[PDB]
Amino acid sequence: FNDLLQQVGGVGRFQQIQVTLVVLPLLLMASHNTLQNFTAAIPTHHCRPPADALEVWLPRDRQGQPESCLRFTSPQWGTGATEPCTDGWIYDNSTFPSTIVTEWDLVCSHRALRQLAQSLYMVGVLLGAMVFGYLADRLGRRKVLILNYLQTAVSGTCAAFAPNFPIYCAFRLLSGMALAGISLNCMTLNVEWMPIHTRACVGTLIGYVYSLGQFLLAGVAYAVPHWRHLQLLVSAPFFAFFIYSWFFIESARWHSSSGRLDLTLRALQRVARINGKREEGAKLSMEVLRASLQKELASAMELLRCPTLRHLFLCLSMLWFATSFAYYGLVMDLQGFGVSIYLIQVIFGAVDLPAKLVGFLVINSLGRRPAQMAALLLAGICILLNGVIPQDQSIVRTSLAVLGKGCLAASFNCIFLYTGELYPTMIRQTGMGMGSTMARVGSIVSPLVSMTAELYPSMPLFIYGAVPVAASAVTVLLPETLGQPLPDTVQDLESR
Ligand SMILES: Nc1ncnc2c1ncn2CCOCP(=O)(O)O
């Protein structure tokens, strides 16, 4: 197929149009994944005084600020009984006009609900990677993308107009399911329509576009602070994506695999018509297609079954869980640092750009494993130190969270490369999917861990730090891949 894709033009005039269009949605993946930092921000809440009759009606904490979850039973002038606040809460409207937290009183006893919603969105992301991955192999990378643009648009719009919390969570799970399928199918449709030598470039562009999405969330959230308006704005473009996605060309590779070379030929000729190498497309017929593509024409149980591939599976699963679990833990707590939540989102997104370069340098220059111990251990040390250092120190805490997020971004880049290199060709793609699945399990478990803040304010961070420190110790077991050719059989893994 690669000989044929190259026959039909060289990365020119279709691949440029379609890849631009298929990677444009990814800009708003960051906006959706981390949308709750802005759509669910917690304004300062203090209890509403009884209407019958704040200094007299609000108990004060050590800080001298009014206590969030309690109000005095009787008016205290100048040990007073404290009742939970039946009459609701008054929320500061200086920074956040409305958030899901203000709208549904997800405060005090129901504070965990704010994180349950993030976990549910991510349960949707895990489910969608699986459902839409199967559906794409059955119905096409394109048809599944068209339906996913419509689902994200409809679910996200309906979430913005959700009348109650259960409904917002349902439409956020479905938003995530669709978005998981968009992220997968954008990779498959672009990679399969692009030459093998350029495959790495496609993958990197997809990563950088997600990072630029972070700056998009910061700029958009500043402009549209209200949550219903911000959720609608971030889900509206997907309708426009759905409208132009009808003109995408289905992967000829998927057509060949299905058995329908008639559609492989039709796609290859259409692309020739676009790339401008028409003559060369006319030459392409079915006697030419059957020839050469002829040569082109294992189960996850294997990863567990073989002891050699089970060791590589377990170790890498710990590495993918840890990086995601910690990364989401840090990225989903922008308010505590003491700087604006918009500046911190911008800084975090601008740390990805030098992190990815430093990581590339260390990966190639030193090794692929030394980079993973360093990226994960340093992130763990930084997150644990962001737990120990007092809150008053905003600059020390911000700088250490920033460095830590950069290190976990490098770990994501290094684990994507290190994994492919570690697995044999037979179970390589299954292994990269299982690793990504464990990453999604990390993002489901992370908000649940954050709910332990009630037990101890620093327990969420101490766990967000200890898990990457343990994963760094696991990397020691994995085998170095720098300068070694990719394995083709289990025997090769074994020889290593
Ligand atoms: N579901 C996900 N699986 C793996 N990695 C993910 C997932 N969602 C977001 N990411 C991170 C994206 O790549 C790492 P980057 O933030 O440096 O681009």
Curated annotation (Swiss-Prot):
Catalytic reactions of this protein: (6R)-L-erythro-5,6,7,8-tetrahydrobiopterin(out) + a dicarboxylate(in) = (6R)-L-erythro-5,6,7,8-tetrahydrobiopterin(in) + a dicarboxylate(out); L-erythro-7,8-dihydrobiopterin(out) + a dicarboxylate(in) = L-erythro-7,8-dihydrobiopterin(in) + a dicarboxylate(out); L-sepiapterin(out) + a dicarboxylate(in) = L-sepiapterin(in) + a dicarboxylate(out); prostaglandin F2alpha(out) + a dicarboxylate(in) = prostaglandin F2alpha(in) + a dicarboxylate(out)
Outcome, altering residue 48 to H: Lower Vmax; increase in substrate affinity and increase in the affinity for the nucleoside phosphonate analogs cidofovir, adefovir and tenofovir
Site for Important for interaction with cidofovir and PAH, residues: 412
Tissues expressing the protein: Strongly expressed in kidney. Expressed at lower level in liver, skeletal muscle, brain and placenta. In kidney, found at the basolateral membrane of the proximal tubule. In testis, primarily localized to the basal membrane of Sertoli cells and weakly expressed in Leydig cells and vascular endothelial cells.
GO biological process terms on file: alpha-ketoglutarate transport; metanephric proximal tubule development; monoatomic anion transport; organic anion transport; prostaglandin transport; renal tubular secretion; sodium-independent organic anion transport
Note: Involved in the renal transport of a variety of drugs with well-known nephrotoxic potential, therefore may play a role in the etiology of the drug-associated nephrotoxicity. Uptakes the diagnostic agent PAH/para-aminohippurate and clinically used drugs. Mediates the pH- and chloride-dependent bidirectional transport of PAH/para-aminohippurate in exchange for 2-oxoglutarate or glutarate as counteranions. Can also mediate PAH/cGMP exchange.
Name of the molecule in the record: Solute carrier family 22 member 6
Name of the gene encoding the protein in the UniProt record: SLC22A6
